[PDB]
A paper describes a structure:
The enzymes are α/β-hydrolases with a catalytic triad typical of esterases. The targets, exhibiting sequence identities as low as 25%, were biochemically characterized using a range of model substrates, and the three-dimensional structures were solved for two of the enzymes.
The tryptophan residue in StGE2 (Trp310) found hydrogen bonding to the 2-OH of the ligand is conserved in the bacterial structures (Trp358 in OtCE15A, Trp348 in SuCE15C, and Trp334 in MZ003), whereas Glu267 in StGE2 which hydrogen bonds with both 2-OH and the anomeric hydroxyl group (in β configuration) is not conserved (Arg303 in SuCE15C, Val313 in OtCE15A, and Ser289 in MZ0003). Gln259 of StGE2 is observed hydrogen bonding with both the 2-OH and 3-OH moieties of the sugar ring, and the equivalently positioned residues (with respect to main chain) in OtCE15A, SuCE15C, and MZ0003 are Glu305, Glu295, and Glu281, respectively. However, in SuCE15C, the loop containing Glu295 is modeled with the acidic side chain rotated away from the active site, and instead Arg296 occupies the equivalent space. A small cleft within the pocket formed by Reg2 contains a conserved phenylalanine residue (Phe141 in OtCE15A, Phe135 in SuCE15C, and Phe117 in MZ0003) and a basic residue (Lys183 in OtCE15A, Arg173 in SuCE15C, and Arg160 in MZ0003). Three of the enzymes, OtCE15D, SuCE15A & C, exhibited exceptionally high catalytic efficiencies (in the 104 s−1 M−1 range) on BnzGlcA, which is 10 to 100-fold higher than reported for fungal GEs. SuCE15C was consistently the most efficient boosting enzyme, followed by SuCE15A and SlCE15A, somewhat reflecting their activity levels on BnzGlcA. To investigate putative lignin- and xylan-binding sites in our solved structures, docking simulations of OtCE15A and SuCE15C with a benzyl ester of 4-O-methyl-glucuronoxylotriose (glucuronoate α-1,2 linked to the middle xylose residue) were performed.
Author numbering: 25 to 345, 347 to 417
Write the structure that this text describes.
Amino acid sequence: DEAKVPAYTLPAVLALKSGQPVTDAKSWTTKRRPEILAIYEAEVYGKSPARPPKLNYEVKSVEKQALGGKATRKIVTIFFSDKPDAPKMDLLLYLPAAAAKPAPVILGLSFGGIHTVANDPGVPLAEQWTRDNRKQPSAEKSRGGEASRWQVEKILAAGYGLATVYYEQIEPDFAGGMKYGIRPLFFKPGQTEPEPGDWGAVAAWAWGASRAMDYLEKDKDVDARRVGLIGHSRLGKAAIWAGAQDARFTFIISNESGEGGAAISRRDYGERTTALNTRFPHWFDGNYKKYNDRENEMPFDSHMALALMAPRGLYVASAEGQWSDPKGEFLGAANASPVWELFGKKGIGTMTMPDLHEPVGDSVRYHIRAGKHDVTEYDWEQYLKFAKAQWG
């Protein structure tokens, strides 16, 4: 019920903390954007390490005519650490078989192992984490189980490749899972746990997407100028911050990403933040918890986080049907859009929430669709049109 939504005044994305106004793109790039990035690094997602000077990886597998002659398939292992039994991740890549040149790639963070992304028997079954917080090999019945969320046939049809990484290889997603992930790798000598401004798990997943990018820009069959990033749900939060931190993504797609993602926090009284920091204490850094239930007012809201993409592409999307707030995510994008105008680009183009199946916008796009929390065939149809507008 929209009459029950509190009203509020958003922090001004185009004013500095002093109150001085941001007057042009120069001033955004040199003054305001660094200040917004610093705010979110300290109070929300946490400080991450710098880019590793050298990527340690191995191309484990390269096959032709995969997917019924439709694709070239690779599988690449990226090591976060020389040690043994150390954290590492398996990047799956499908490039179109007919590719005459290095091809654009959509990179994605996946909720399942690489065997869930297509119905491809050449792909080894991956060990996944379960409802009981155990890790164990996946059953063959699970192959292609996420296939409808990735629609690889449409992507190749459009002339593009798809790259995916299973996110829990970077850090498993349950409270207590940090010890199995990359964050312990960067502790100071005799450091037991993260300081309250250090990266949390969302930040860790984002940092992994950027190491996937490190590899994509070495692969001669990939157009390193034409990579984008997609994430769903909690991984849409990750994708927002990876986009903020990593200028190489020409666009990000953030599908139904909620609180700490695209959604405007001030549309409730801090209860989503508490629920998240309570149930998922690993997601955000220790400073974020002071904002629970408005015990402190946030010196930010989500339109500022989304503006960290400007002037690159941004697609926000929602589903009609729950525990989500689609209009909150629309208003995230619409209130970030002024920043794209500083650069001569077009944003959402409206402040009125559209109806079902009516995509709006140019460099910032939005749609709401029927159905449940998911990624569907309808979504990818609009995403691949976005991608064409973004890539030429």
